[PDB]
């Protein structure tokens, strides 16, 4: 398995007829492991902001979750494990692994639940592989 294969075939594949708009596997230092064509470049402090929220859940919500300069409202996630964001009919799921981040960005008609499922299920599988 390449990381590009995990992105192309396991994150960017169909789920219930829908597809993520973009996806990435990113080291917690901010190093891209692999990403899709339209996944944005992270801006400064963005990865740091994400990790601080995993470390202290609730830190990010007041100011918002930023990815590629796009602001998402933080909605309910899983403390220290999953960050979820909403932006109108779109949003994002960030799933923490031991040393990486699995990220999916969706837009209508794809649902939050579909994005959560495809992103979080791969994260759990990669965690059990020691990643």
Residue numbers in the entry: 1 to 131
List passages from the publication reporting this PDB structure.
Profilin is an ubiquitous cytoskeletal protein that interacts with several molecules, such as actin, proline-rich ligands, and phosphoinositides to perform several cellular functions. Profilin is also an important allergen present in pollen grains, food plants, and rubber tree, and it is considered a pan-allergen, because it is present in all eukaryotic cells and is therefore involved in allergic cross-reactions. In this work, we focus on the study of two plant pan-allergens, profilins from the rubber tree (rHev b 8) and maize (rZea m 12), in their monomeric and dimeric forms. Here we isolated the monomeric and dimeric species of the recombinant profilin allergens rHev b 8 and rZea m 12 and obtained their crystallographic 3D structures.
The rHev b 8 and rZea m 12 crystals (5 mg/mL) were obtained using the conditions described in the materials and methods section. These crystals diffracted to resolutions of 1.9 and 2.2 Å, respectively, and belonged to the P43212 space group. A backbone alignment of the two 3D-structures reveals that they adopt the same conformation, with a root-mean-square-deviation (rmsd) of 0.27 Å. The sequence alignment shows that the principal differences are between residues 37ANFPQFKSEEITGIMSDFH55for rHev b 8 and 37ENFPELKPEEVAGMIKDFD55 for rZea m 12. These residues are structurally located in a region exposed to the solvent, mainly in the loop that connects β-strand 2 and α-helix 2, but some also belong to α-helix 2. The assays showed that mAb 2F5 specifically recognizes monomeric rHev b 8, even at a low concentration (2 μg/mL); conversely, mAb 2F5 showed no reactivity towards monomeric rZea m 12, suggesting that this IgE recognizes a conformational epitope on the surface of rHev b 8 that is not shared with rZea m 12. Interestingly, the flexible loop and α-helix 2 do not participate in the establishment of the rHev b 8 dimer interface and the competitive ELISAs between monomeric and dimeric rHev b 8 confirmed that this region is exposed for interaction with mAb 2F5. However, between the monomeric and dimeric forms of both allergens we observed a significant difference in the IgE binding (P < 0.001), which suggests that the monomer has additional IgE epitopes in the region that establishes the homodimer interface. When the cells were stimulated with monomeric rHev b 8 using the same and two fold the concentration of the dimer (130 and 260 nM, respectively) the release of β-hexosaminidase reached near half of the homodimer, and the positive controls responses P < 0.001.
